[PDB]
Design a protein around this ligand. Structure first.
Ligand SMILES: Nc1nc(N)c2ncn(Cc3csc(Cl)n3)c2n1
Length: 167
């Protein structure tokens, strides 16, 4: 038993809700929140900008020290950093950004990072301003992640479409 409430059950291990990831993390305080990061951990918009803003820029400060020491992530890769006031940990995961010309086949690789964590609160990777098809991202998530993932979709209209089209 965990603290997640109000989710539609999609499969044995995947759940979904129409929620802003920031409000959802502040309420649950999960062990792991996933950030939809870029390789530079530059948290400008989408999920990253919203999460970072909620940490009063502490996420960005921590991230800049990480990059200065380790260099950029790979597309498809991840790193674990602090969750600040939102979670114990933040798993920064880089899905392919379609609007950047990155290979969408790396979306499966990106979701594989979730399997290193028993339970996660996460957004749909590569959706929204990353330019991939959200229906596709949800399908790759369900077909790749084996651990317990609580998916949050902020756009109501998108949420309704994802549910009604899910096989
Ligand atoms: N659950 C949630 N909460 C937000 N505050 C939010 N903002 C943009 N998206 C969609 C998204 C997924 S991956 C990238 Cl990039 N954007 C969000 N999803």
């Amino acid at each position: 038993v965990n603290s997640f409430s109000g989710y539609l059950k999609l499969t044995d291990n995947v759940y979904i809700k129409n929620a802003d990831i920031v409000e959802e993390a502040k309420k649950v305080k999960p062990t792991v929140v996933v950030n939809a990061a870029n390789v530079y951990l530059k948290h400008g918009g989408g999920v990253a900008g919203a999460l970072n803003k909620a940490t009063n820029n502490a996420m960005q400060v921590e991230s800049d020290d990480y990059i200065a020491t380790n260099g950029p992530l790979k597309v498809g890769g991840s790193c674990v950093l602090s969750g600040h006031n939102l979670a114990k940990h933040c798993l920064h995961v880089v899905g392919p950004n379609v609007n950047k010309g990155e290979d969408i086949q790396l979306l499966k690789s990106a979701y594989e990072n979730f399997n290193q964590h028993e339970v996660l609160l996460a957004p749909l990777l590569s959706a929204g301003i990353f330019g991939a098809d959200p229906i596709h991202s949800l399908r790759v998530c369900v077909d790749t992640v084996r651990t317990n993932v609580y998916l949050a979709v902020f756009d109501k209209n998108l949420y309704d479409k994802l549910v009604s089209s899910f096989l």
